[PDB]
Amino acid sequence: VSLEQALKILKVAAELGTTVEEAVKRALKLKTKLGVSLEQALKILEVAAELGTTVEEAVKRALKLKTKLGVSLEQALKILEVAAKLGTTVEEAVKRALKLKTKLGVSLEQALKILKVAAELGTTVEEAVKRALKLKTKLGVSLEQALKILEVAAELGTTVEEAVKRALKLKTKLGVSLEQALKILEVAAKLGTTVEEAVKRALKLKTK
């Protein structure tokens, strides 16, 4: 059990309002029923809790999208998730994700993350791009990392500079990457706990 998966578990349980044991059971049931990875199974459970629908409907609509557009399951699930957060149809979420790809030269995956981040911030797309591009240039991070920093600052209710400060203090305290430090911070905020506590549980959970 990876630290990323363990953190993903804590977070999904929180999103679901269950204990982690119950979340895990639910995720292992799906994994077997679909022959998917644990990572995928948790993504499906996350999307149902963000859709405010059933695990079963999420799955149903995802495979419909998979077959319809020929995308991966992950991609189908982000699309469903972005459309929900945008309040739009998936046809419309896909149209905007393509107009962003063209407008910037980025992948579908990246377009969709931008759209989601703008939605979460309640900012325009153009303004989210501006903020992400500025971090990209100030710290030499990838686009995706710039976007993770944006969300986490929001989640915390602090500035991206203080988000960055803390994440770097974690890379240092624990010897993890920047991505992992951002996940841990996202996860402690979501759980409403200190990062020490989140990590302790994550390590504690890493006997699954």
Could you describe the 3D structure shown?
This protein has 12 helices and no strands. The protein has one domain. It is mostly helical and 208 residues long. It is classed as de novo protein.
What brief labels describe this structure?
12 helices, left-handed, alpha helix, mainly alpha, de novo protein, globular
Layout of secondary structure:
Blueprint: H1 3-16, H2 20-34, H3 38-51, H4 55-69, H5 73-86, H6 90-104, H7 108-121, H8 125-139, H9 143-156, H10 160-174, H11 178-191, H12 195-205
Cα separation of the termini? 6 Å
**Cα Rg:** 17 Å
Q: Which structural class best describes the helix and strand composition? A: mainly alpha
How would you describe the shape?
Answer: globular
Order of helices and strands: HHHHHHHHHHHH
Summed up, the domain count is 1
Number of helices: 12
Estimate the strand proportion: under 5%
Number of strands: 0
Helix content: over 70%
Largest sheet: none
PDB class: de novo protein
Keywords: toroid, computationally designed, left-handed, DE novo protein
Assembly: monomeric
Entry title: Computationally designed left-handed alpha/alpha toroid with 6 repeats
